[PDB]
Design a protein around this ligand. Structure first.
Ligand SMILES: *[C@@H]1O[C@H](CO)[C@@H](O[C@@H]2O[C@H](CO)[C@@H](O[C@@H]3O[C@H](CO[C@@H]4O[C@H](CO)[C@@H](O)[C@H](O)[C@@H]4O)[C@@H](O)[C@H](O)[C@@H]3O)[C@H](O)[C@H]2NC(C)=O)[C@H](O)[C@H]1NC(C)=O
Ligand SMILES: *[C@@H]1O[C@H](CO)[C@@H](O[C@@H]2O[C@H](CO)[C@@H](O[C@@H]3O[C@H](CO[C@@H]4O[C@H](CO)[C@@H](O)[C@H](O)[C@@H]4O)[C@@H](O)[C@H](O)[C@@H]3O)[C@H](O)[C@H]2NC(C)=O)[C@H](O)[C@H]1NC(C)=O
Ligand code: HEM
Ligand code: HEM
Ligand SMILES: CC[C@H](CO)NC(=O)Cc1c(C)n(C(=O)c2ccc(Cl)cc2)c2ccc(OC)cc12
Ligand SMILES: CC[C@H](CO)NC(=O)Cc1c(C)n(C(=O)c2ccc(Cl)cc2)c2ccc(OC)cc12
Ligand SMILES: *[C@@H]1O[C@H](CO)[C@@H](O[C@@H]2O[C@H](CO)[C@@H](O)[C@H](O)[C@H]2NC(C)=O)[C@H](O)[C@H]1NC(C)=O
Ligand SMILES: *[C@@H]1O[C@H](CO)[C@@H](O[C@@H]2O[C@H](CO)[C@@H](O)[C@H](O)[C@H]2NC(C)=O)[C@H](O)[C@H]1NC(C)=O
Ligand SMILES: *[C@@H]1O[C@H](CO)[C@@H](O[C@H]2O[C@H](CO)[C@@H](O)[C@H](O)[C@H]2NC(C)=O)[C@H](O)[C@H]1NC(C)=O
Ligand SMILES: *[C@@H]1O[C@H](CO)[C@@H](O[C@H]2O[C@H](CO)[C@@H](O)[C@H](O)[C@H]2NC(C)=O)[C@H](O)[C@H]1NC(C)=O
Ligand SMILES: CCCCCCCCO[C@@H]1O[C@H](CO)[C@@H](O)[C@H](O)[C@H]1O
Ligand SMILES: CCCCCCCCO[C@@H]1O[C@H](CO)[C@@H](O)[C@H](O)[C@H]1O
Ligand SMILES: CCCCCCCCO[C@@H]1O[C@H](CO)[C@@H](O)[C@H](O)[C@H]1O
Ligand SMILES: CCCCCCCCO[C@@H]1O[C@H](CO)[C@@H](O)[C@H](O)[C@H]1O
Lengths: 553, 553
C-alpha cells in the first residue's frame, strides 16, 4: 500500500498524516489554505497571491535603482524595507524547530535533543517506490559521475561580483561554528550545540576547552609571541585537542577552539584576528571596570564579539553577497514590535547549501609567490612567516570563484561535493522541486527551465528521468544564475531565511539582552554598533593592509 | 569602598553597574523610567502608574462579583481578561533568562548552560556590610530558631478555601518535574533540564531511563499486574535507579521516572494514574494510525500528556488555588497576537516559594484507618493494598493545611523549611523588600505592616533589626493573608508570573506546534482540549471515586 505521503499531496506547508492503512489527511491549519490538500486559498491568501510579484522581479528592483536607492538609503524607507526584509524571511522557518533524522513529526525529543540537526521538510518516506517519492528512476545518478560531469571545474569561472578570498575564508570560518557534523554520532548530528553565532569556534564548544584556551587573568586568552606578533598559543600550553597532522605538535601547533582550524592558513588567520581582538576588548573593559573580575571581563567580551560578528556578517558579508543597492542594516530594535522567537536551530538543509566549495581558486597567489594546494593545505608556518597584515592583503586581492552556474568546484576538493550528494541521500532529503515549493516558489517544469541552457539539461533528464526527481544539492548548484549573481535564484531564496533567522535569532538580539549594560558600559555597545571588517583587522595589526569582501578596483 | 550596588540604587529593573572603583550607573533602558537611578517616569509610565489600581483591590474584584462574573464568564470578556491576565504577568520575567548563581550579569554561559537555575534579581554582592546589603544586623536569625518560632505548627490551621490532599500531592508531584536540585552539583543546579512541563518525572529525565521504562511495543510503558490492577513495573524489569530504602528492591519496588517517587504513596499514586493514562492514550492512537510505529505512538502520547497536564494545571489547579470567580482558561491561541517567547527556564526564587510544605496534614486519614507519618512515609505497600480508586477518594476528602499566616508547617518536615532558609542564604537572595519592588509592589515599611498582627511583628524586628533585612522565604510565609486566601499577597503576585510564563512558555503552546497533526489526528487534540482531573482518574480506574482539588461539601 504505497505510503500515500509519498506523493507529497499536502501543499503550502500542510502536514501529511496517514490514517488507517491506506488513507491520509492534511493539516492545513494556519497555512492560509483549506481543503483536502491545502489548495483552496483563503480570502487574503488569494489577494496575497495575486498582488505578489515574482522573486526574480524583486531581485531586479533591488539590483537596479542606482538613484532610487541612494534616496531610499538616505530615508527611513531603508528601515521599513529592512524590517520587512526580516520578518517575511524568518517567517518561513518553523520555531520552535520541527523534525530531525529520527522523527518526521513533532516530538518532545526533537525539541529538547540539541544533538540533532533539524529539517524543514520531512524526509522521504522510507518505503516509497522511487528513492525520491514516486517519480524518477529506481536508482539515482552515481554521485561520482554526476559530480565530475557537472560540478567538476574545467576553466575557473570567477565571481561576477568581485567576491574575493578574504571573503571565502570568513565564510568558511564563520559557518564552521554551527556546522560540525559529529563524525562519531554520524550525519544529522552536531558537536556544535548552541546553533547560533555563539562563537564556539573560538572559545571552543565545551567548558574545559574554554578553560584550556582561557588564560584566567584579566579575562584574556592564552597566546604566544612569534616575531613580536600575537598568535594562538601552542598545545604545549593549551592542552587542547586538535587535528594537526603527525608532525610537530610542539610549536607551530596552535590551539584555537575549532579543532580543525590548523589545517588551513586562512582559518588560523581569522582565529588569530579574533583572538587578538578579544584580548583587545578585554583591555578596554579592564579600564572601565577596574573592580571587575576575570569571569565577567571574559563573558562581557564574548558578548561583544557575538555582536561585532552579527554586525559585520549582516552589513558587509551579506551586503557584498547580495549585490543590493539597498544598504542592509543591523539593528535588533527593528524587530521589537514583531512576533519573533529568539532561538535558532541549525538545519541540515542549511548545512547542505552552505557548501560553497567552488569559491575556492586554482592556486593561492600571495604577492610574487603562488602556492599550489599541496603547498597550502596543512601548511603550518605560512601564517607566522608572512604576517597577518601581508596575508590579509593577499586574500583581499585574489578573486574567488563563482558558486553557481555549474562546473566550478576545483578538482581537488571535488570529493567534499560527492559526499554532500552521497550524504544527502543518507538523510533522504525530498526532491529539489519540493524544496522550491516549501520555500514559496514554483517547481521547475523541465531540466530545460532549470538550467540556463540546453546541453547540460539533456544529460540531466537522461539521468534523473524527470525534473521532479532532481536532488537538493545538485539542483542548487546547476540552477541558472541571474547575470552577475554569485549564485542562482534558489540559493538566495532558500538560504536567506535560514541565515537571517540565525543572525537575528541570537539571544543578544532580543529586547531582554540588547541593553548597554550587557556589554558593560557604553563602550561595549558602541563597539558592537560600529564594528567593521576594516576595524577588525587594522585595529589588531601593526600596518593597515587592504581588507574587504571584494577585490580592489 | 562599599560596592555601591549594595544599596540597590537602581529602581524599576534598572541594571546597576560599577564604573571605576567607587562609582556606578543604572541602565534604565526600557524600564519606562529615566535619570540616575530610574525614578523619573516617562510620560505613559506616569499615567500607567496613576491609573493603576492596587493588587489587593484587583484581588477583591476577582473574588466578589458573584453575578458580574457569571456574565463575564458567559461572554467574550472572559477571553479578553485571560489574554490580559497572561501577557501582563509573563512580561515580568526576563526572556531569554538573565542570571545564575555564577554570574550577576548577562553571559553567553548563563544563556547556554541549562544545568544552572536562573535568578530574577542579582545575588547580594559578596562584599557588602550586612548579609543582605546595608541594613540589618551583622548576622541573620538562626534558621533553626526562626523556623521553630514562626513556621512550626502548633494547632493545624486548615485552608479556608477547601483545598484538599488530593491537591497537595498533584502539586508536589507536578512541581518535582522541574525542581530537582542536583545534590551532587549542589544548590542552584538542576538534574531536571527541560525546565518546563516536559514530564521528565514520568518518562524520566535521561534517554536511557526512558528506554528503561519504555516497553518498546505500541509505544506503551512497562508495568505489572498486581490484583488485576496496572502499576509501575518493578526494577526487576525496569533496571532503573530509584531511592527506595534498603528493603525489598524486588517487588513493591517500582520504576517511575522520578527516582524519589517511591518514598510516598501519593506520588506513586499519581505516577500510576499517569502511567496508566499514557498507555491508555497509546491504545487510541494505534487504532487511528495502525501503520504508525512505536517511536511515534510514544512521542505523540508524550505530547498529549504535556497538553492534558497544562490544561488541568491551569483550568483546575490554578482555578481552585485562585478563588477567582473569573473562570480561568487554557487556549494557546490567546497569545498568538502578542510578543511571547516560547521558552521557559526555572528560577531559584520560584523553587523557593513553591515549598508548600505546610499543605501537609497532621496524620493521614484513609477511611476508618489513620496512619501517622511514621506509617505513611516510605510505606511501600499502601498503594497496591488500597487501590488507586480508594486512595484517591481518601485524599480528595482530607483538608490540606493553609500555606500562609505563619506557624503551620508540621513538626516532622519542619527541617525542609530550615533548609530552604539556610540555602536561601547560600544563594545570597536579596531581601524580601527588594523582591516586592522587582515584582511591581511597594516595600513594607515595618514588620507591623507586613504581618497581619503585632505580636510576631515584635519578635521579628528584634531579630532582623529592620524590615529591609527580612529574608525571601521567611517573609513570604509570614505575610498577612487576605481572609479565605490559601496564602498572602506576595505569594500570589510573585509566583503567578513564574507559573504562567512556564505553563504557556511550553513549545506545544506555540503557533508552530499547536496543530491537530502534532497530536496525530483530531482525537489527540480533543483529549488535550477536554482533559479534566475527573477524567484522568475515572478513565483509568474500575470504579469512579471522588476526585477534586477541594474537599467535598
Ligand atoms: C555548566 O557549568 C558548570 C559550572 O561551571 C559545569 O561544571 C563544572 O565544570 C568545570 C569545568 O568543566 C569543573 O572544573 C573544576 O575546576 C578545577 C580547576 O581546574 C584546574 O585549574 C585550571 C582550570 O582550567 C587548569 O590550569 C588546571 O589544569 C586544572 O584544570 C578542575 O581541575 C576540576 O576538574 C573541577 O571539576 C567544575 O568542577 C564543574 N562542576 C560544577 C558543576 O561546578 C558544567 O559542566 C556546565 N554544564 C554543561 C553540561 O555545560
Ligand atoms: C539525542 O538522541 C541520540 C539518538 O537517540 C542519543 O544517542 C543515542 O542514545 C541511545 C540511548 O541513550 C543509544 O542506544 C543504543 O541502543 C542499544 C540498544 O539497547 C538495547 O535494547 C534495549 C534498549 O533499551 C534494552 O532492553 C537492552 O538492555 C539494550 O539497552 C544500546 O544497547 C546501546 O547502548 C546503544 O548505544 C544510541 O546508540 C546513542 N547514540 C546515537 C547518537 O545514536 C543522545 O544521547 C541524545 N542526546 C542527548 C545528550 O540527550
Ligand atoms: C580550502 C578549501 C576547502 C577545503 C579543502 C574544504 C574541505 C572540506 C572537507 C574535507 C570537508 C569534510 C567532508 C564533507 O563533509 O564532504 C568539508 C566540509 C564542509 N565545508 Fe569545506 N572545504 C573548503 C572550503 C569551504 C568553504 C569556503 C566553505 C564555506 C562557504 C566550506 C564549508 C563547508 C561545510 C559547511 C562543510 C560541512 C561541515 C559539516 O560536516 O557539517 N568549506 N570541507
Ligand atoms: C509528605 C510531605 C512532604 C515531605 C516529607 C517533603 C520532604 C521534602 C524533603 C526531605 C526535601 C529535601 C530537602 C530540602 O530541600 O529542604 C523536599 C524538597 C522540596 N519539596 Fe517537599 N516534601 C513534602 C511535600 C511537598 C509538597 C506538597 C510540595 C509542593 C507544593 C513540596 C515541594 C518541594 C520542593 C519544591 C522542594 C525542593 C526540591 C529541590 O531540591 O529543588 N514538597 N521536600
Ligand atoms: C530583499 C529580500 C531578499 C529575499 O530573498 N533578499 C535577502 O533577504 C537578502 C539576502 C540574504 C539574507 N542572503 C544570505 O544571507 C544568504 C546566505 C547564505 C545562503 Cl546559502 C543563502 C542566502 C543573500 C544571499 C544572496 C543574495 O543575493 C544574491 C541576497 C541575500
Ligand atoms: C488576575 C491576575 C492575578 C495576578 O496576580 N492572578 C493570577 O494571575 C492568577 C493566579 C495564578 C496564575 N496563580 C498561580 O498559578 C501561582 C502558583 C504558584 C505560586 Cl508560588 C504562585 C502563584 C495563583 C495563585 C493564587 C491566586 O490567588 C489566591 C491567583 C493565582
Ligand atoms: C609552507 O609555506 C612556506 C611559506 O611560508 C613554504 O616555503 C616557501 O616556499 C617558497 C617556494 O615554494 C620559497 O620561495 C619561500 O622562500 C619559502 N619560505 C620559507 C623561507 O620557508 C613551504 O614550502 C610550505 N610547505 C609546504 C606544505 O609545501
Ligand atoms: C504500610 O501501610 C499498611 C497499609 O496498607 C500498614 O498495614 C495496615 O496497618 C493497619 C494498622 O496500622 C491495619 O489495621 C491494616 O490491616 C494493615 N494492612 C495490612 C493488612 O497490611 C502498614 O503498617 C504500613 N507500614 C508501615 C510503614 O508502618
Ligand atoms: C490531493 O492529492 C492527491 C495526491 O495525488 C490527489 O490524488 C488522488 O486523486 C487523483 C485524481 O482524483 C488521482 O490522480 C490519484 O490517483 C489519487 N491518489 C491519491 C493519493 O488518493 C487528490 O485528488 C488530491 N485531492 C484533490 C481532490 O484535489
Ligand atoms: C541614587 O541612589 C543613591 C543610593 O543611595 C543615592 O544616594 C547618594 O546620594 C544620597 C543623597 O544625595 C546620599 O544619601 C547617599 O550617601 C549617596 N550614596 C551614593 C550611592 O552615592 C543617590 O542620591 C540617588 N540619586 C539621586 C540624586 O536620586
Ligand atoms: O524577498 C521576498 O521574500 C518573501 C519572503 O520569503 C518571498 O515571498 C518572496 O518570493 C521574496 O522575493
Ligand atoms: O523585468 C524583470 O527582469 C528580470 C531579469 O531580466 C526577469 O527575470 C523578470 O521576470 C522581469 O520581471
Ligand atoms: O493582576 C495584576 O497583574 C499585573 C502584572 O503583574 C500587576 O501590575 C498588578 O499588580 C496585578 O494585580
Ligand atoms: O475595597 C478593597 O478591599 C480590600 C480588601 O478588604 C482592601 O485591601 C483594598 O485596599 C480595597 O480597595
Amino acid at each position: 500500500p504505497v505510503n500515500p505521503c509519498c506523493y507529497y499531496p499536502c501543499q503550502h506547508q500542510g502536514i501529511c498524516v496517514r490514517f488507517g492503512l491506506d488513507r491520509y489527511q492534511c493539516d492545513c491549519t494556519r497555512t492560509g489554505y483549506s481543503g483536502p490538500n491545502c489548495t483552496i486559498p483563503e480570502i487574503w491568501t488569494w489577494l496575497r497571491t495575486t498582488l505578489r510579484p515574482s522573486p526574480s522581479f524583486i531581485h531586479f528592483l533591488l539590483t537596479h535603482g542606482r538613484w532610487l536607492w541612494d534616496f531610499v538609503n538616505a530615508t527611513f524607507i531603508r528601515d521599513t524595507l529592512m524590517r520587512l526584509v526580516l520578518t517575511v524571511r524568518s517567517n518561513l522557518i518553523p520555531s520552535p524547530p520541527t523534525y530531525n533524522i529520527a522523527h518526521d513529526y513533532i516530538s518532545w525529543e526533537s525539541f529538547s535533543n540539541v544533538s540533532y540537526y533539524t529539517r524543514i521538510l520531512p524526509s522521504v518516506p522510507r518505503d516509497c517506490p522511487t528513492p525520491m517519492g514516486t517519480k524518477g528512476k529506481k536508482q539515482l545518478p552515481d554521485a561520482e559521475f554526476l559530480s565530475r560531469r557537472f560540478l567538476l571545474r574545467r576553466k575557473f569561472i570567477p565571481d561576477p561580483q568581485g567576491t574575493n578570498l578574504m571573503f571565502a575564508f570568513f565564510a568558511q570560518h564563520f559557518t564552521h561554528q554551527f556546522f560540525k557534523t559529529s563524525g562519531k554520532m554520524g550525519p544529522g548530528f552536531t558537536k556544535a550545540l548552541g546553533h547560533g553565532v555563539d562563537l564556539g569556534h573560538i572559545y571552543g564548544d565545551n567548558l574545559e576547552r574554554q578553560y584550556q584556551l582561557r588564560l584566567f587573568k584579566d579575562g584574556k586568552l592564552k597566546y604566544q609571541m612569534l616575531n613580536g606578533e600575537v598568535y594562538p598559543p601552542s598545545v604545549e600550553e593549551a592542552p587542547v585537542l586538535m587535528h594537526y597532522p603527525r608532525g610537530i605538535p610542539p610549536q607551530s601547533q596552535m590551539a584555537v577552539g575549532q579543532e580543525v582550524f590548523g589545517l588551513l592558513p586562512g582559518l588560523m588567520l581569522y582565529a588569530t584576528i579574533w583572538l587578538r581582538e578579544h584580548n583587545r576588548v578585554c583591555d578596554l573593559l579592564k579600564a572601565e571596570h577596574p573592580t571587575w573580575g576575570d569571569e565577567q571581563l571574559f563573558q562581557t567580551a564574548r558578548l561583544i564579539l557575538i555582536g561585532e560578528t552579527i554586525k559585520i556578517v549582516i552589513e558587509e558579508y551579506v551586503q557584498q553577497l547580495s549585490g543590493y543597492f539597498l544598504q542592509l542594516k543591523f539593528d535588533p530594535e527593528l524587530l521589537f514590535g514583531a512576533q519573533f522567537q529568539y532561538r535558532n536551530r541549525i538545519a541540515m538543509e542549511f548545512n547542505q547549501l552552505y557548501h560553497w566549495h567552488p569559491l575556492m581558486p586554482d592556486s593561492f597567489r600571495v604577492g610574487p609567490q603562488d602556492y599550489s594546494y599541496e603547498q597550502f593545505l596543512f601548511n603550518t608556518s605560512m601564517l607566522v612567516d608572512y604576517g597577518v597584515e601581508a596575508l590579509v592583503d593577499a586574500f583581499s586581492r585574489q578573486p574567488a570563484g563563482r558558486i553557481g552556474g555549474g562546473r566550478n568546484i576545483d578538482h581537488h576538493i571535488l570529493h567534499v561535493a560527492v559526499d554532500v550528494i552521497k550524504e544527502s541521500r543518507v538523510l533522504r532529503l525530498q526532491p529539489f522541486n519540493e524544496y522550491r515549493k516549501r520555500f514559496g516558489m514554483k517547481p521547475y517544469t523541465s531540466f530545460q527551465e532549470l538550467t540556463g541552457e540546453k546541453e547540460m539539461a539533456a544529460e540531466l533528464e537522461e539521468l534523473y528521468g524527470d525534473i521532479d526527481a532532481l536532488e537538493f544539492y545538485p539542483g542548487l548548484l546547476l540552477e541558472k544564475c541571474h547575470p552577475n549573481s554569485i549564485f542562482g535564484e534558489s540559493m538566495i531564496e532558500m538560504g536567506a531565511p535560514f541565515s537571517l533567522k540565525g543572525l537575528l535569532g541570537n539571544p543578544i538580539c532580543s529586547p531582554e539582552y540588547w541593553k548597554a549594560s550587557t556589554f558593560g558600559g557604553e563602550v561595549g555597545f558602541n563597539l558592537v554598533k560600529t564594528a567593521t571588517l576594516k576595524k577588525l583587522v587594522c585595529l589588531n595589526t601593526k600596518t593597515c593592509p587592504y581588507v574587504s569582501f571584494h577585490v580592489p578596483d
